Protein backbone atom coordinates (compact mmCIF):
# COMPACT_ATOMS: atom_id res chain seq x y z
CA UNK A 1 0.00 0.00 0.00
CA UNK A 2 2.20 2.78 -1.30
CA UNK A 3 4.50 3.36 -4.67
CA UNK A 4 7.47 2.82 -2.21
CA UNK A 5 6.63 -0.15 -0.76
CA UNK A 6 5.18 -2.46 -4.07
CA UNK A 7 6.87 -3.03 -7.56
CA UNK A 8 4.58 -2.27 -10.35
CA UNK A 9 6.77 -2.27 -13.76
CA UNK A 10 8.17 -4.78 -16.21
CA UNK A 11 10.44 -4.82 -19.47
CA UNK A 12 7.91 -7.80 -20.86
CA UNK A 13 11.19 -9.35 -20.87
CA UNK A 14 12.38 -12.99 -19.43
CA UNK A 15 16.07 -12.88 -18.11
CA UNK A 16 17.63 -15.89 -18.94
CA UNK A 17 19.77 -16.21 -16.12
CA UNK A 18 20.18 -16.63 -12.92
CA UNK A 19 17.77 -19.28 -13.20
CA UNK A 20 17.46 -22.34 -15.70
CA UNK A 21 14.87 -21.68 -18.27
CA UNK A 22 13.66 -24.02 -20.47
CA UNK A 23 10.74 -22.49 -23.52
CA UNK A 24 8.40 -25.14 -24.44
CA UNK A 25 8.26 -23.45 -27.80
CA UNK A 26 5.37 -24.92 -29.32
CA UNK A 27 4.76 -28.28 -26.75
CA UNK A 28 3.27 -28.25 -23.62
CA UNK A 29 4.98 -29.42 -20.35
CA UNK A 30 2.36 -32.80 -21.04
CA UNK A 31 3.44 -33.90 -24.89
CA UNK A 32 6.76 -33.50 -24.06
CA UNK A 33 6.55 -36.29 -21.18
CA UNK A 34 3.95 -38.31 -23.71
CA UNK A 35 6.64 -37.99 -26.53
CA UNK A 36 4.82 -36.06 -28.95
CA UNK A 37 6.51 -36.19 -32.04
CA UNK A 38 7.23 -32.38 -32.27
CA UNK A 39 8.40 -32.52 -28.68
CA UNK A 40 11.51 -35.32 -29.35
CA UNK A 41 13.93 -32.06 -28.97
CA UNK A 42 13.06 -32.48 -25.08
CA UNK A 43 14.11 -35.87 -23.86
CA UNK A 44 15.57 -35.84 -20.80
CA UNK A 45 15.78 -32.16 -20.19
CA UNK A 46 16.12 -30.10 -16.29
CA UNK A 47 14.81 -26.79 -16.01
CA UNK A 48 14.40 -24.38 -12.06
CA UNK A 49 11.36 -22.81 -14.84
CA UNK A 50 9.63 -24.43 -17.74
CA UNK A 51 7.77 -22.05 -19.80
CA UNK A 52 4.79 -22.71 -21.95
CA UNK A 53 3.35 -20.80 -24.71
CA UNK A 54 -0.20 -19.78 -25.27
CA UNK A 55 0.27 -21.26 -29.03
CA UNK A 56 1.29 -24.84 -28.33
CA UNK A 57 -0.69 -27.68 -29.56
CA UNK A 58 -0.60 -31.58 -30.19
CA UNK A 59 -0.07 -33.64 -33.18
CA UNK A 60 0.14 -36.80 -32.22
CA UNK A 61 -3.25 -39.48 -30.57
CA UNK A 62 -6.45 -37.60 -29.02
CA UNK A 63 -5.45 -37.63 -25.46
CA UNK A 64 -6.98 -36.32 -22.01
CA UNK A 65 -5.27 -36.30 -18.63
CA UNK A 66 -8.13 -36.96 -15.99
CA UNK A 67 -5.77 -35.78 -12.84
CA UNK A 68 -3.83 -33.13 -16.11
CA UNK A 69 -3.67 -29.98 -13.38
CA UNK A 70 -1.73 -32.43 -10.86
CA UNK A 71 0.06 -34.20 -13.18
CA UNK A 72 1.54 -31.21 -14.90
CA UNK A 73 2.46 -29.66 -11.40
CA UNK A 74 4.05 -32.93 -10.24
CA UNK A 75 6.36 -33.04 -13.10
CA UNK A 76 6.96 -29.25 -13.43
CA UNK A 77 7.96 -29.31 -9.65
CA UNK A 78 10.64 -32.06 -10.37
CA UNK A 79 12.26 -30.45 -12.76
CA UNK A 80 13.15 -33.34 -15.09
CA UNK A 81 12.37 -35.18 -18.05
CA UNK A 82 14.87 -37.51 -17.07
CA UNK A 83 13.56 -41.02 -18.61
CA UNK A 84 14.95 -44.49 -18.22
CA UNK A 85 13.98 -47.85 -20.22
CA UNK A 86 12.65 -50.47 -18.63
CA UNK A 87 11.84 -54.26 -20.10
CA UNK A 88 8.74 -55.10 -19.27
CA UNK A 89 7.62 -58.64 -20.14
CA UNK A 90 4.57 -58.45 -22.71
CA UNK A 91 4.69 -62.01 -23.73
CA UNK A 92 1.51 -62.89 -25.53
CA UNK A 93 0.56 -59.56 -27.36
CA UNK A 94 1.64 -57.28 -30.16
CA UNK A 95 3.78 -54.35 -28.87
CA UNK A 96 4.30 -51.10 -30.68
CA UNK A 97 1.18 -50.01 -32.32
CA UNK A 98 1.15 -46.86 -34.56
CA UNK A 99 -1.60 -44.96 -35.84
CA UNK A 100 -1.24 -42.43 -39.01
CA UNK A 101 -2.63 -40.14 -36.24
CA UNK A 102 0.47 -39.80 -35.14
CA UNK A 103 3.09 -38.66 -37.69
CA UNK A 104 7.33 -39.20 -36.95
CA UNK A 105 9.00 -38.45 -39.46
CA UNK A 106 6.56 -39.47 -42.48
CA UNK A 107 5.57 -42.18 -41.14
CA UNK A 108 2.81 -44.03 -38.70
CA UNK A 109 4.10 -43.43 -34.82
CA UNK A 110 3.27 -43.02 -31.61
CA UNK A 111 4.18 -41.45 -28.38
CA UNK A 112 7.67 -41.92 -27.92
CA UNK A 113 7.62 -43.10 -23.59
CA UNK A 114 4.36 -45.44 -24.56
CA UNK A 115 3.71 -48.72 -25.89
CA UNK A 116 0.00 -49.61 -27.52
CA UNK A 117 -0.16 -53.14 -26.90
CA UNK A 118 -2.89 -55.44 -29.03
CA UNK A 119 -3.94 -59.18 -29.75
CA UNK A 120 -1.42 -61.74 -30.47
CA UNK A 121 -3.27 -64.68 -32.71
CA UNK A 122 -6.69 -63.44 -31.30
CA UNK A 123 -5.86 -63.53 -27.81
CA UNK A 124 -5.26 -60.85 -25.57
CA UNK A 125 -3.98 -63.06 -22.42
CA UNK A 126 -4.41 -61.95 -18.62
CA UNK A 127 -1.51 -59.95 -18.47
CA UNK A 128 -0.10 -59.71 -14.79
CA UNK A 129 3.35 -57.96 -15.23
CA UNK A 130 5.59 -56.31 -11.98
CA UNK A 131 8.47 -54.38 -11.81
CA UNK A 132 10.03 -53.46 -8.60
CA UNK A 133 11.78 -50.64 -7.57
CA UNK A 134 15.25 -51.77 -6.00
CA UNK A 135 16.59 -47.91 -6.78
CA UNK A 136 17.34 -45.39 -3.99
CA UNK A 137 14.68 -42.93 -5.73
CA UNK A 138 11.36 -42.67 -6.74
CA UNK A 139 9.90 -43.82 -10.29
CA UNK A 140 7.01 -41.97 -12.04
CA UNK A 141 5.32 -44.37 -14.69
CA UNK A 142 3.12 -42.94 -16.92
CA UNK A 143 0.37 -44.94 -18.80
CA UNK A 144 -3.13 -44.91 -20.35
CA UNK A 145 -6.17 -46.67 -21.47
CA UNK A 146 -7.84 -46.27 -25.28
CA UNK A 147 -11.28 -45.77 -26.21
CA UNK A 148 -12.07 -47.71 -29.05
CA UNK A 149 -14.30 -45.47 -31.68
CA UNK A 150 -16.76 -48.71 -32.14
CA UNK A 151 -16.95 -52.33 -30.94
CA UNK A 152 -15.70 -53.59 -34.21
CA UNK A 153 -12.90 -51.24 -33.75
CA UNK A 154 -12.60 -52.86 -29.97
CA UNK A 155 -12.72 -56.28 -31.46
CA UNK A 156 -10.25 -55.85 -33.98
CA UNK A 157 -7.50 -54.50 -31.61
CA UNK A 158 -8.45 -56.36 -28.20
CA UNK A 159 -9.90 -59.79 -29.39
CA UNK A 160 -11.77 -58.61 -25.98
CA UNK A 161 -15.13 -56.77 -25.82
CA UNK A 162 -13.92 -55.18 -22.73
CA UNK A 163 -10.32 -54.43 -21.13
CA UNK A 164 -10.37 -54.25 -17.74
CA UNK A 165 -6.58 -52.50 -16.77
CA UNK A 166 -5.87 -52.56 -12.57
CA UNK A 167 -2.26 -51.09 -11.34
CA UNK A 168 -1.10 -51.03 -8.51
CA UNK A 169 1.98 -50.75 -5.85
CA UNK A 170 1.82 -51.58 -1.79
CA UNK A 171 0.46 -47.70 -1.88
CA UNK A 172 -2.22 -47.04 -4.04
CA UNK A 173 -4.55 -49.02 -6.71
CA UNK A 174 -6.14 -47.57 -9.77
CA UNK A 175 -8.53 -49.47 -11.68
CA UNK A 176 -10.06 -48.29 -15.28
CA UNK A 177 -11.90 -49.63 -17.81
CA UNK A 178 -12.39 -48.20 -21.91
CA UNK A 179 -15.15 -45.97 -22.50
CA UNK A 180 -16.38 -46.85 -26.22
CA UNK A 181 -17.75 -44.46 -28.74
CA UNK A 182 -17.60 -42.10 -31.28
CA UNK A 183 -16.18 -38.42 -30.12
CA UNK A 184 -15.30 -35.63 -32.61
CA UNK A 185 -12.37 -36.80 -34.94
CA UNK A 186 -9.40 -35.23 -34.31
CA UNK A 187 -6.48 -35.63 -37.16
CA UNK A 188 -9.21 -37.99 -38.78
CA UNK A 189 -9.85 -39.44 -34.77
CA UNK A 190 -13.13 -40.57 -33.44
CA UNK A 191 -11.40 -42.84 -30.47
CA UNK A 192 -9.31 -41.40 -27.59
CA UNK A 193 -7.15 -42.44 -25.23
CA UNK A 194 -6.78 -40.91 -21.42
CA UNK A 195 -3.40 -40.56 -19.20
CA UNK A 196 -2.68 -42.04 -15.67
CA UNK A 197 0.20 -42.23 -13.70
CA UNK A 198 2.00 -44.35 -10.83
CA UNK A 199 4.53 -43.40 -8.25
CA UNK A 200 7.03 -46.59 -7.38
CA UNK A 201 8.44 -45.57 -3.90
CA UNK A 202 12.29 -47.62 -3.04
CA UNK A 203 10.91 -51.40 -1.76
CA UNK A 204 7.87 -51.15 -3.54
CA UNK A 205 7.20 -53.14 -6.61
CA UNK A 206 4.63 -51.98 -10.16
CA UNK A 207 1.92 -54.56 -10.49
CA UNK A 208 -0.05 -53.84 -13.89
CA UNK A 209 -3.77 -56.51 -14.63
CA UNK A 210 -4.54 -56.53 -17.95
CA UNK A 211 -7.08 -57.78 -20.11
CA UNK A 212 -7.11 -55.12 -22.90
CA UNK A 213 -6.94 -51.66 -23.91
CA UNK A 214 -3.70 -51.12 -21.83
CA UNK A 215 -1.25 -48.32 -23.16
CA UNK A 216 2.12 -49.37 -21.40
CA UNK A 217 4.48 -47.59 -20.10
CA UNK A 218 8.52 -48.08 -21.59
CA UNK A 219 9.96 -47.12 -18.53
CA UNK A 220 9.77 -44.62 -15.83
CA UNK A 221 10.70 -40.48 -15.31
CA UNK A 222 12.85 -39.64 -12.05
CA UNK A 223 11.85 -37.09 -9.87
CA UNK A 224 14.41 -34.90 -9.01
CA UNK A 225 13.37 -31.72 -7.34
CA UNK A 226 10.65 -29.87 -5.53
CA UNK A 227 11.08 -26.20 -6.39
CA UNK A 228 11.42 -26.40 -10.03
CA UNK A 229 7.77 -25.35 -11.38
CA UNK A 230 6.44 -23.96 -14.78
CA UNK A 231 4.32 -20.80 -15.84
CA UNK A 232 2.78 -19.83 -18.93
CA UNK A 233 4.01 -16.91 -20.69
CA UNK A 234 4.46 -15.32 -24.23
CA UNK A 235 7.61 -13.09 -23.08
CA UNK A 236 10.57 -13.29 -25.44
CA UNK A 237 13.83 -14.84 -22.92
CA UNK A 238 16.56 -12.77 -23.27
CA UNK A 239 20.02 -12.11 -22.57
CA UNK A 240 19.97 -10.10 -18.67
CA UNK A 241 19.90 -11.44 -15.14
CA UNK A 242 17.28 -10.96 -13.17
CA UNK A 243 15.95 -12.60 -9.91
CA UNK A 244 12.08 -12.59 -9.57
CA UNK A 245 10.32 -14.21 -13.14
CA UNK A 246 7.16 -13.46 -13.13
CA UNK A 247 4.70 -14.12 -16.76
CA UNK A 248 5.13 -10.52 -17.54
CA UNK A 249 8.88 -10.65 -17.56
CA UNK A 250 11.45 -10.90 -14.97
CA UNK A 251 11.55 -8.05 -12.44
CA UNK A 252 14.34 -7.04 -9.66
CA UNK A 253 14.00 -8.07 -6.21
CA UNK A 254 13.97 -5.16 -4.58
CA UNK A 255 10.90 -3.51 -2.43
CA UNK A 256 8.39 -6.01 -0.03
CA UNK A 257 5.86 -6.27 -2.17
CA UNK A 258 5.01 -6.33 -5.38
CA UNK A 259 1.50 -5.97 -8.04
CA UNK A 260 2.85 -7.20 -11.08
CA UNK A 261 1.19 -11.37 -11.25
CA UNK A 262 0.29 -13.28 -8.23
CA UNK A 263 2.41 -15.69 -10.72
CA UNK A 264 6.12 -15.85 -9.83
CA UNK A 265 9.48 -17.86 -9.75
CA UNK A 266 12.71 -17.09 -7.65
CA UNK A 267 13.81 -14.69 -4.85
CA UNK A 268 10.45 -12.22 -5.31
CA UNK A 269 8.91 -9.57 -3.62
CA UNK A 270 5.29 -10.79 -2.42
CA UNK A 271 2.20 -10.62 -4.13
CA UNK A 272 -0.09 -7.70 -2.73
CA UNK A 273 -3.31 -6.44 -4.74
C1 LIG B 1 7.15 -63.61 -19.35
O1 LIG B 1 5.87 -63.88 -18.76
C2 LIG B 1 5.31 -65.20 -18.97
C3 LIG B 1 4.12 -65.29 -18.04
O2 LIG B 1 2.90 -65.44 -18.75
C4 LIG B 1 6.33 -66.32 -18.68
O3 LIG B 1 5.84 -67.56 -19.17
C5 LIG B 1 7.69 -66.03 -19.29
O4 LIG B 1 8.64 -66.98 -18.82
C6 LIG B 1 8.16 -64.64 -18.88
N1 LIG B 1 9.49 -64.37 -19.39
C7 LIG B 1 10.54 -64.18 -18.59
C8 LIG B 1 11.85 -63.92 -19.27
O5 LIG B 1 10.43 -64.21 -17.36
C1 LIG C 1 9.18 -52.32 -29.90
O1 LIG C 1 9.92 -51.09 -29.95
C2 LIG C 1 11.06 -51.13 -29.07
C3 LIG C 1 11.58 -49.73 -28.92
O2 LIG C 1 11.17 -48.91 -30.01
C4 LIG C 1 12.07 -52.09 -29.68
O3 LIG C 1 13.22 -52.11 -28.84
C5 LIG C 1 11.46 -53.48 -29.72
O4 LIG C 1 12.32 -54.35 -30.43
C6 LIG C 1 10.08 -53.50 -30.39
N1 LIG C 1 9.45 -54.78 -30.12
C7 LIG C 1 8.71 -55.45 -31.00
C8 LIG C 1 8.17 -56.77 -30.52
O5 LIG C 1 8.46 -55.00 -32.12
Redesign the pocket.
Known amino acids: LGSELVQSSSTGEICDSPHQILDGKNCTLIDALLGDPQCDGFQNKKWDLFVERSKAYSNCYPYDVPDYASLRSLVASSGTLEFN?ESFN?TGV???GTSSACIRRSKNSFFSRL?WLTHLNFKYPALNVTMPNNEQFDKLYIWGVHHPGTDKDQIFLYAQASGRITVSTKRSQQTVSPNIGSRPRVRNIPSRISIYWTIVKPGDILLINSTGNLIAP?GYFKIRSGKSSIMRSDAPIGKCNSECITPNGSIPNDKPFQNVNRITYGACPRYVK
Open positions: NWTQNNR
